């Protein structure tokens, strides 16, 4: 028993993190096969980050202006292309610790582990959710850029995120591994604010099921509700509307625990209307929305 | 900026996790050099566990009754000793991915990352604090035993925990890597209860400093207090008494932020007496005590 915000093992990813340096600016890169991927703002100086012209900046760069380094060993760059907001540096050595991988684009509400690095070296690993407003709330500082987010299905590493910037609200923005940003953000320092951050709801439900599986039942009630009467309430508290697809997704957990999804929705309705009244759920005093149904089922049934 | 409960990279440890099977019972083991360490209750059946005599149980066991396996590859056991609550199985192959390591015994309030495994295979990694009452609150299920807790100092892996059991209160107990339990617990299924757990006050303070460093100041006040007047209040809310040694430890964070420890103590006093009144701190609605001062300084200054 017990339930914790657990992240995927980071070993396979550690083997791929290298350091990329262009002039003065240094950041992390991902080394898969004989290709190194990294945030393109590597080529910027601090001076022109206000609104850099990356096409013009790249024209004046050559292979040798990029210093890629796998720990102690130097990597020779033998080609470089800009793909959206990422650089693809071809190196002359294939990473032999390159795992089976895929590049994926996740949806808001889905989760992944981030391996935060500095100078191509691991710092630590934590779990994130891609927020409805297409930001994430992690821990990054300078040098963090090029740190990747990912999931693991047995042998295969699904890379879904590469870190690029932090918004003035204290939240973070990045791209997929094809260099396409999540949300309306761009790799330049303008006053781009984030949109309203809403609560994922289905995830809160999954987490309430996790709570039941691990011995918390105080929040359960004899009440039930309709999707419509639930959603009328949920919207008031800045929650994503719950759809029939969401209900379908919550099926396995509902069946496992023998608590109907609409009964659990009723409990969440009571929780939102009246608060927790001093009590806690799995050691939290507010409703957690960064656990997917698959996350809960994974942890609770000990998947490797 | 931003502050998450980050967990150390698990790669070096992953390389050491093997599967150990004795008869029907299977659990995880740690393979360092040519030695495999694992919880001794591996030799028990289901019945045995009520109150096993391990000396008597070990009489009928031989090298060949232990099936050690590093993923797909089989390990030949060529010797086995019982050292406290752990078995030391000597195998005929030295783990070539054996990192620089130490075995350490942690103190209550100190933290470490746990790599939860099943059938010698990684599941995930999360951070823990050794509680004042010598338990931890993690995620373990059957087959998790032999999962290890650890810290990393550059090249060196400091193994400090190996998982053994879950108490009826839903909390977890284990040993160090010499097989000596943390707290008064034993590897048998009797009603041996844990002591009342208190809150690690110094850690809560460190975490409030983390909050300040990452842009939360709403909880700061024009009040200050004495250690004595603080502790009178802290005792009421089941908090560890704060000592001058604790104050000394909080020096660097106090100096960095320019907020006296006793001013921060006053803020914690207000927080405890009046609650957070709808606001949050680093995305939590109750006071976190599983971050050490060293944890905060590490994360905030991007140590690898």
Numbering used by the authors:
A (entry chain B), B (entry chain A): 1 to 304
Article sentences:
The SARS-CoV-2 main protease (Mpro) is the drug target of Pfizer’s oral drug nirmatrelvir.
Q192T (9.2-fold lower kcat/Km), Q192S (8.9-fold), Q192L(4.3-fold), Q192A (6.2-fold), Q192I (5.6-fold), Q192P (7.6-fold), Q192H (8.2-fold), Q192V (9.0-fold), Q192W (8.0-fold), Q192C (7.0-fold), and Q192F (3.5-fold) had comparable enzymatic activity as the WT, and all showed resistance against nirmatrelvir (>22.2-fold increase in Ki). S144L, M165Y, H172Y, and Q192T represented some of the biggest changes in both the residue size and the enzyme activity, with a decrease of ∼127×, 39×, 13×, and 10×, respectively, in kcat values. This suggests that the interactions between the oxyanion hole and the inhibitor thioacetal hydroxide, as well as, by extension, the substrate transition state, are likely weakened in the S144L and Q192T mutants, resulting in an alternate conformation in the inhibitor crystal structure. In addition to these effects on the reaction center, the M165Y and Q192T mutations also directly impacted ligand interactions in the S4 site.
